[PDB]
Amino acid sequence: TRELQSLAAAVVPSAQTLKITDFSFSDFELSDLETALCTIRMFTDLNLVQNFQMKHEVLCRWILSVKKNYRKNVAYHNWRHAFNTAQCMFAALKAGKIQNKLTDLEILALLIAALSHDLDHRGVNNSYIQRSEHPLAQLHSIMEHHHFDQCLMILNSPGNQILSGLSIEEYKTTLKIIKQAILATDLALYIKRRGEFFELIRKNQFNLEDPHQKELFLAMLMTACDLSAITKPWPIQQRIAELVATEFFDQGNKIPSMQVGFIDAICLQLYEALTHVSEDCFPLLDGCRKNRQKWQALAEQ
Ligand SMILES: O=C(O)/C=C/c1ccc2c(=O)[nH]c(Cc3cccc(Cl)c3)nc2c1
Ligand SMILES: [Mg+2]
Ligand SMILES: [Zn+2]
Known part of the structure; x- marks a missing residue:
């Protein structure tokens, strides 16, 4: 409640001041409270506070509840990862001008989903807890369903109902x-559905007015921001790879070639497709290409 008193009383600086419009944004120098103020600014500058009449105190309480339900003893899959995913979504809607291709309800859900998509993640090496639970449902997007359950629980908590x-x-x-x-x-799900996305772009048949293709685009955009750490400037990306390695190996060199393979198999084609949808999202592809060059040079020793 003392953290809520400071957050609700603070003046929220502008998006430019907070640098949340830049695809190169990084959070290493920010306090937890500073990340909450940036999150208010994302809601405000997307007009989500205005168009959906969000009480200031409820939004702050909701943001702090979301933050507290991430586990900081998890090296990568924590609140800062969700905060960065949301920031990339905000930057994609603003700096990438994607905002005008979507409705307010879609923007509202994307921001909330970005912030909530990993709630209560226990670390990649602690998947035994989600197996003590659902011991039959282990051989389903087991974790993503639990993340949404957590998100829904917070959206419904007293004083937290931003909708x-x-x-x-x-x-x-x-x-x-x-x-x-x-x-x-x-x-x-990304690997299962990305093929249809790519051929639609390749065949120049990509149609946002199609309800199926709009939903497909929303999925690809979520993946694009989820993995956006791979697009950051080289000093940022080195630090993130450190966090990914800690969670993976140390439950908290082989890394260069692992990063190159991850870029090739997963990331490069997605950011390539996204730039065909909107050329203003090119910085993500450009940043990803530069990181592949750096990791590949290290991989060659
Ligand atoms: O679910 C999410 O929220 C995002 C997921 C994610 C993010 C970054 C990354 C990322 O840099 N590299 C890799 C490849 C990898 C795998 C295992 C160890 C290492 Cl040292 C690297 N995999 C990654 C996976
Ligand atoms: Mg996840
Ligand atoms: Zn994630």
């Missing part, structure tokens, strides 16, 4: 988009 200003129809619609968006962060 109370929505009508019941807008709420059901928003909840559905949130659910699909969080579930899309399952890389298996």
